[PDB]
């Protein structure tokens with residue numbers, strides 16, 4: 001531009017938000033499972049793990065969460081189940 | 092132009108936004124999230140896994156509180172910290 005410059009910035013903005021029930025960790029067999037790169041959400045009856053910037057729910061598995069200690073120390077621990085996707089191949 | 096009672100409102104709004112919605116209020120709509128679950132995000136950001144925070148949550152909280160208290164006593168003593176703000180005033184008066 002005459003005696004200057006102009007920048008056109010292209011950026012990304014979240015648009016529509018929904019709002020659920022959340023928990024810090026899951027206790028399965030006396031072990032607390034923490035998410036790897038996501039966050040635990042609940043739609044009312046079931047528990048999923050979602051990426052933090054886009055609602056894309058998925059089934060909790062052993063490949064998706066990492067275990068650390070027992071579930072007596074954390075505050076908002078909750079109760080659920082983890083698939084451990086090796087049973088069908090075992091049979 | 093802005094009276095001293097409006098800057099306080101601005102800072103209060105910024106504080107409420109940053110303690111009730113994390114950093115998401117500066118890039119779009121404000122999305123709420125619990126504070127102990129936001130400190131875990133920050134810990135993961137600096138390079139420490141989140142399971143460190145929860146298992147040491149209570150202790151960490153205490154530390155934070157103590158630090159804040161020290162500030163309240165640090166500013167009253169050593170009457171030279173606010174000099175950067177004081178000098179300005181003096182300078183103007185001197186000129187006049």
Ligand SMILES: *[C@@H]1O[C@H](CO)[C@@H](O[C@@H]2O[C@H](CO)[C@@H](O)[C@H](O)[C@H]2NC(C)=O)[C@H](O)[C@H]1NC(C)=O
Pocket residue numbers: 043044045046
């Ligand atoms: C919360 O999500 C779960 C998981 O999809 C929903 O459960 C499914 O609901 C559909 C619709 O009726 C059924 O066809 C599936 O069989 C259900 N899954 C299971 C494992 O039973 C649940 O309905 C959702 N909650 C609400 C309130 O919609």
Ligand SMILES: *[C@@H]1O[C@H](CO)[C@@H](O[C@@H]2O[C@H](CO)[C@@H](O)[C@H](O)[C@H]2NC(C)=O)[C@H](O)[C@H]1NC(C)=O
Pocket residue numbers: 078079
């Ligand atoms: C999650 O599971 C644990 C372990 O089963 C529950 O802790 C037990 O709860 C029962 C009540 O149904 C008590 O009788 C036991 O003494 C508890 N401790 C054990 C079994 O070690 C815990 O309550 C569950 N969390 C829920 C239901 O929110």
Ligand SMILES: *[C@@H]1O[C@H](CO)[C@@H](O)[C@H](O)[C@H]1NC(C)=O
Pocket residue numbers: 017018019
């Ligand atoms: C989140 O849940 C609260 C519970 O009352 C509700 O008032 C609010 O509207 C919800 N947020 C959205 C975006 O629906």
